[PDB]
C-alpha cells in the first residue's frame, strides 16, 4: 500500500556495479538484469571487468537487492526494503569465512532514474593465498538458504545474521557467516518490521558465448514466517 512498495509492479530493471579490493587485489563486476517483486524473482547477468575474478563467484552472491522479495500480502506491513524507496537503503556486511579471511561491504540500493541500483564497496581482508577462496576451490553453485530478518530500532533499520555453506570442490564444507545491517538512505519514515524471514533459492549459469569472466544468475525469493 506504500508509494514505494507500488514501485515494484512491474518490471524493475537493475543494475549493480561493485569495486572490490581483497588482500590487495582489487576488481570489479558490473551486472545487469530486472527484478519482478511480485513473483520475487531476478535475472541478471555479471560481468568481471578488470578480467579474472579474484575470488569465486559463489562468495559474492549475497554481496552482489532484497527489495524483490515478494512478500505475501498478509504480510504487507513488513517490507522494509521497499518502503524505503525510492531513497533506499545502504547495506552493510560482515562476511566471515571460516579459516580464512573477511569481507566487509557497504552498499547503497536505490532508484536511479526508473532503474534499481546496487553499488557496493567491498574490502577483504585476512585471505590465504592458497585457501579456499583465492585458490578457487568452490563449486560452482548455490544453496537454498533462510536469512531471519529483525528490527533495530535504535538504527532505525533492520538486522540479520546467517551462515552460508559453499561447497568445496573436494566435498568439504566452507561456511561464510554473515552479518548484515540496514538503514534507510532517506530521512522519511519506513515501516520497522516484526521478525519474519526471507527464503532464497539461487541458480547459476554460464554463457558460452561470452568470453569474459562472468555470472548468469536466477534468483528466487519469498519472505514468510508471519501468521497474521
Same mark, same amino acid.
Given at each position: 500500500?506504500? @508509494?514505494?512498495?507500488?514501485?515494484?509492479? +512491474?518490471?524493475?530493471?537493475?543494475?549493480?556495479?561493485?569495486?572490490?579490493?581483497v588482500?590487495g587485489? @582489487?576488481?570489479?563486476?558490473?551486472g545487469?538484469?530486472? +527484478?519482478?517483486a /511480485?513473483? +520475487?524473482?531476478?535475472?541478471?547477468k555479471?560481468?568481471?571487468?578488470?578480467?579474472?575474478?579474484?575470488? *569465486?563467484?559463489?562468495?559474492?552472491?549475497?554481496?552482489?537487492?532484497?527489495?524483490?522479495?515478494?512478500?505475501?500480502?498478509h504480510?504487507? #506491513?513488513?517490507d522494509?526494503? @521497499?518502503?524505503?524507496?525510492?531513497?533506499?537503503?545502504?547495506?552493510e #556486511?560482515?562476511?566471515?569465512?571460516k579459516?580464512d579471511? /573477511?569481507?566487509? /561491504?557497504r %552498499?547503497e540500493?536505490?532508484?536511479?532514474?526508473?532503474?534499481?541500483?546496487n553499488?557496493?564497496?567491498?574490502?577483504?581482508?585476512?585471505?590465504?593465498?592458497?585457501?579456499?577462496?583465492?585458490g578457487?576451490?568452490?563449486?560452482? =553453485?548455490?544453496?537454498?538458504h533462510?536469512?531471519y530478518? /529483525? %528490527?533495530?530500532?535504535?538504527?532505525?533499520?533492520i538486522? %540479520? =545474521?546467517f551462515?552460508? #555453506?559453499?561447497?568445496?570442490?573436494?566435498g568439504?564444507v566452507?561456511?561464510?557467516?554473515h552479518?548484515?545491517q540496514?538503514?534507510?538512505?532517506?530521512? +522519511?519514515?519506513?515501516?520497522? *518490521?516484526?521478525?519474519?524471514?526471507?527464503?532464497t533459492?539461487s541458480?547459476l549459469?554460464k554463457d558460452?558465448?561470452? @568470453? #569474459?569472466?562472468?555470472?548468469?544468475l536466477?534468483?528466487?525469493?519469498? %519472505?514468510?514466517?508471519?501468521?497474521?
Amino acid at each position: 500500500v506504500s @508509494k514505494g512498495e507500488e514501485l515494484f509492479t +512491474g518490471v524493475v530493471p537493475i543494475l549493480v556495479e561493485l569495486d572490490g579490493d581483497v588482500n590487495g587485489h @582489487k576488481f570489479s563486476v558490473r551486472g545487469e538484469g530486472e +527484478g519482478d517483486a /511480485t513473483n +520475487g524473482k531476478l535475472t541478471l547477468k555479471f560481468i568481471c571487468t578488470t578480467g579474472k575474478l579474484p575470488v *569465486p563467484w559463489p562468495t559474492l552472491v549475497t554481496t552482489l537487492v532484497q527489495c524483490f522479495s515478494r512478500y505475501p500480502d498478509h504480510m504487507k #506491513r513488513h517490507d522494509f526494503f @521497499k518502503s524505503a524507496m525510492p531513497e533506499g537503503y545502504v547495506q552493510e #556486511r560482515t562476511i566471515s569465512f571460516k579459516d580464512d579471511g /573477511t569481507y566487509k /561491504t557497504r %552498499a547503497e540500493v536505490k532508484f536511479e532514474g526508473d532503474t534499481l541500483v546496487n553499488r557496493i564497496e567491498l574490502k577483504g581482508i585476512d585471505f590465504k593465498e592458497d585457501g579456499n577462496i583465492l585458490g578457487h576451490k568452490l563449486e560452482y =553453485n548455490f544453496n537454498s538458504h533462510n536469512v531471519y530478518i /529483525t %528490527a533495530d530500532k535504535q538504527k532505525n533499520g533492520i538486522k %540479520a =545474521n546467517f551462515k552460508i #555453506r559453499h561447497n568445496v570442490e573436494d566435498g568439504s564444507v566452507q561456511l561464510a557467516d554473515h552479518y548484515q545491517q540496514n538503514t534507510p538512505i532517506g530521512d +522519511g519514515p519506513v515501516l520497522l *518490521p516484526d521478525n519474519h524471514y526471507l527464503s532464497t533459492q539461487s541458480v547459476l549459469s554460464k554463457d558460452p558465448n561470452e @568470453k #569474459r569472466d562472468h555470472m548468469v544468475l536466477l534468483e528466487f525469493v519469498t %519472505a514468510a514466517g508471519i501468521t497474521h
